[PDB]
Design a protein around this ligand. Structure first.
Ligand SMILES: [Zn+2]
Lengths: 115, 155, 99, 105, 60, 83, 25
RNA sequence: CCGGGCACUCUAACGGGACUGCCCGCGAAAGCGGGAGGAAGGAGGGGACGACGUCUGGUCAGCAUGGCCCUUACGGCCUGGGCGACACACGUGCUACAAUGCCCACUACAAAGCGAUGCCACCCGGCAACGGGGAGCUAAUCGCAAAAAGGUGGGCCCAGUUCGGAUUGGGGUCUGCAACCCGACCCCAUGAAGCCGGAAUCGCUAGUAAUCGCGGAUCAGCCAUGCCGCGGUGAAUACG
């Protein structure tokens, strides 16, 4: 339900609904769901409130989530810049850093076709 | 092919009906090399045509493939630098093979979710004579009768 | 007791010389283990036909290291005297080891 | 008393020993309907006996190496033909039109 | 740089990962085989004269 | 990279030179050919000169660098555009 | 997939053993 | 597992055997139909092989070879880079986007290759790459070595959805004294994008279209999804 405040997952099958949060996936979701022991088979509309609050207090206080992870990646790219590194330089050009080839395919972050 | 008549090929018979008219039907729905999916989706259809109506899946399949195979078909012939389309009696070797080819394309256009209910309903639609494949056959048979006047450019 | 191994390439004269060693051991009387043939080890090399810029059109060579094994369980005194001076190497390496 | 047959197709060598009995069949020490669980062409190897109507007149010991599933069963029926031409070789004039002793290349 | 390269290639020290394999008669910098230590052309030349033992033009 | 079972920046030449420098002072220029390692944890304000294959370029050290190597600051590429 | 490490296809492609792909049939 | 037989499987050798002979048809003949017989046919499937000539299309930068040429050099030297660059057009490799799909549990399947300057049994400790030992093997015996696709059993279900998953963050393993622009690893955390691909394009007619592991060579290290083998598995298709 209303787990991480503003970000709200609900609507038919809580197990895949928690995957829909930035920071929680299928592996960590199966981790939290196996720890809380709730069977994933039921939906979110048939659930007890205490299980939702314990889900909240578990995933909200155990790992790094939405606010801190987004701010952390922001500080990460700010750390890549202002040091004169190839990674920060490459992020400043707005081009991929994982050794791809720009003679033919880097359009995802290069943007539209600029003929 | 130039001189040899492209030698005929008989398939191995079916394992549940012992016939061969169902073998090529399994083989065309066999996509990218999956006979385990092909024969199972064909046998699923044979199971569906038990509850949709109380008929045998062999006798309903014969009716599904008898109407869809055409009698005539037009071909473009060059007689003196001009292409005239003439209709002719389509060979029985091509009749069933083009018939099942029409059946699979008629079933893949159906808006149903599963392919089993897509192929099963279109089979009885072909047996009744209202399916898309017999519709495609009806386009050709009316095109041939429209080109009926080509009765002196035959071969 | 004694393992006699023949290491060669050509199974033709290799099998022939091995069969003749078996025949000479049968000439010596007592039984001897049959010629159990070990499998051949293949060392393949893919080279190019042209001497430049041709990624396709490869040719492939091979190295066939054939091995034959005979084991003597009846070391008769002149059998071992005969098998040390009657060694005729036809390009085959011989290994006579005791255990 | 004992009839041996060999069947080879698609790298699956079938070594078949059929003995006179009730019709029981065993594959590599284990049995037919459990080693051929949920498949659809298990009767394809039994077809050469159905053709001569030898339903329950032959027991068989089966040892096959190599391949997958279908090369094994086709090699089985090839061995049944190779051995049913051994015992009572009159089955050639009724075997050749249906096509059993045919190693598919 | 065709004699100096094969002369400096024999100097396996100064961080052996900076060292590379080479042909010994021809001198090609790439595709030299670790089983023979010769270039592909050197193999094509020698093994066809029967000068290379154990090899055979495979045909199967 | 280099794991945590082993330590980062294991170089004995320039480190002995700069530890001899940090005790006396005056912070002059230091030439270096080995850009194979890190310089960021305990050196700030020092002027070095790293070779890019053609000319020894000068590099001053800052504080905003946590674990960056030496050679990524001085590239060897001379692009200057293509058109 | 074949570039990802938190799946099985990429584990087969990289030929490595790990948590998501252990040795147990 | 052992005596033991070792017929056999096996691993070589090396022969035999299938070749439009047979007969009927057809055609002057050639050739073209039928069966017989086989493990294999009417060349079994292929491998090698590539007539005289060809563009003198390629290279003295594989090496020679006419010449020209620099020698305190175009030689060597050692250092660092770079050759790995990007705003980019092209092909050529690879997976997928799910429900005949995704994980998860044992069981079972080859076949090719290396290695006592190495392959490395096996443990211990670690989740681990690894280390502390180290057995056996110059090696069908010791070893690399798990074959895998699979099956069944369960978890799920067309939901960016256990599918798929960039990248960022930091730590453990080892090769090179030394790994940053430029090696491979073990791990977390996030997961980009792809739910299905224009004009066009070409491949290929029975073991191929697909499809799965396993080795070997250039390796110190790996860039390799590069290559070559090696086996598992095998549909239609060819009327015109
Ligand atoms: Zn060479």
């Amino acid at each position: 339900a209303r787990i991480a405040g503003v970000e709200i997952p609900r609507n038919k099958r809580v197990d895949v609904a928690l995957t829909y949060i930035y920071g929680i996936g299928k592996a960590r979701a199966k981790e939290a769901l196996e720890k809380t022991g709730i069977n994933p088979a039921t939906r979110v509309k048939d659930l007890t409130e205490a299980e939702v609050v314990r889900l909240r207090e578990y995933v909200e206080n155990t790992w790094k989530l939405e606010g801190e992870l987004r701010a952390e990646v922001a500080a990460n790219i700010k750390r890549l810049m202002d040091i004169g590194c190839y990674r920060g330089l490459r992020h400043r050009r707005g081009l991929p850093v994982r050794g791809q080839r720009t003679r033919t395919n880097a359009r995802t972050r290069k943007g539209p076709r600029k003929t | 092919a130039r001189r040899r008549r492209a030698e005929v090929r008989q398939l191995q018979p079916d394992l549940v009906y012992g016939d061969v008219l169902v073998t090529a039907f399994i083989n065309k729905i066999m996509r990218d090399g999956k006979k385990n999916l092909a024969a199972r989706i064909f046998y699923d259809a044979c199971k569906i045509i038990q509850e949709k109506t109380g008929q045998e899946p062999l006798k309903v399949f014969k009716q599904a493939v008898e109407n869809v195979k055409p009698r005539m078909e037009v071909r473009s012939r060059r007689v003196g630098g001009a292409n005239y389309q003439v209709p002719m009696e389509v060979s029985p070797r091509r009749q069933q093979s083009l018939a099942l080819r029409w059946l699979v394309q008629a079933a893949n256009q159906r808006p149903e979710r599963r392919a089993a209910v897509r192929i099963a309903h279109e089979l009885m639609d072909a047996a009744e004579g209202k399916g898309g494949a017999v519709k495609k056959k009806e386009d050709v048979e009316r095109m041939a009768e429209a080109n009926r006047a080509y009765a002196h450019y035959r071969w | 007791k004694i393992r006699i191994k023949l290491r060669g390439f050509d199974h033709k004269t290799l099998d022939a010389s091995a069969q003749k060693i078996v025949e000479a051991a049968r000439r010596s009387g007592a039984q001897v283990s049959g010629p159990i043939p070990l499998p051949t080890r293949v060392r393949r090399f893919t080279v190019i036909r042209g001497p430049f810029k041709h990624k396709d059109s490869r040719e492939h060579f091979e190295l066939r290291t054939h091995n034959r094994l005979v084991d003597i369980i009846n070391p008769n005194r002149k059998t071992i005297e005969q098998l040390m001076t009657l060694d005729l190497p036809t390009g085959v390496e011989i290994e006579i080891k005791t255990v | 008393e004992q009839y041996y047959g060999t069947g080879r197709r698609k790298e699956a060598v079938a070594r078949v020993f059929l003995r006179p009995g009730n019709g029981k069949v065993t594959v590599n020490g284990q049995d037919f309907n459990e080693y051929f669980q949920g498949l659809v062409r298990a009767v394809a190897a039994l077809e050469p006996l159905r053709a001569v109507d030898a339903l329950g007149h032959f027991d068989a010991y089966i040892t096959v190496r190599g391949g997958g599933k279908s090369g094994q069963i086709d090699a089985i029926k090839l061995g049944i033909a190779r051995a049913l031409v051994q015992y009572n070789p009159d089955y050639r004039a009724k075997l050749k039109p249906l096509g059993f002793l045919t190693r598919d290349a | 740089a065709r004699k100096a390269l094969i002369e400096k290639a024999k100097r396996t020290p100064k961080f052996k990962v900076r060292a590379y394999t080479r042909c010994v008669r021809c001198g090609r910098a790439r595709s030299v085989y670790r089983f023979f230590g010769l270039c592909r052309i050197c193999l094509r030349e020698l093994a066809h004269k029967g000068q290379l033992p154990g090899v055979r033009k495979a045909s199967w | 990279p280099r794991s945590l079972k082993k330590g980062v920046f294991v170089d004995d030449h320039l480190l002995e030179k700069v530890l001899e420098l940090n005790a006396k002072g005056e912070k002059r220029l230091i030439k270096t050919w080995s850009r194979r390692s890190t310089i960021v944890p305990e050196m700030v304000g020092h002027t070095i000169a790293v070779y890019n294959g053609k000319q020894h370029v000068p590099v001053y050290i800052t504080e905003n660098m946590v674990g960056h190597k030496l050679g990524e600051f001085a590239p060897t590429r001379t692009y200057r555009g293509h058109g | 997939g074949k570039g990802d490490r938190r799946t099985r296809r990429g584990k087969i492609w990289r030929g490595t053993y790990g948590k998501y792909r252990p040795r147990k049939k």
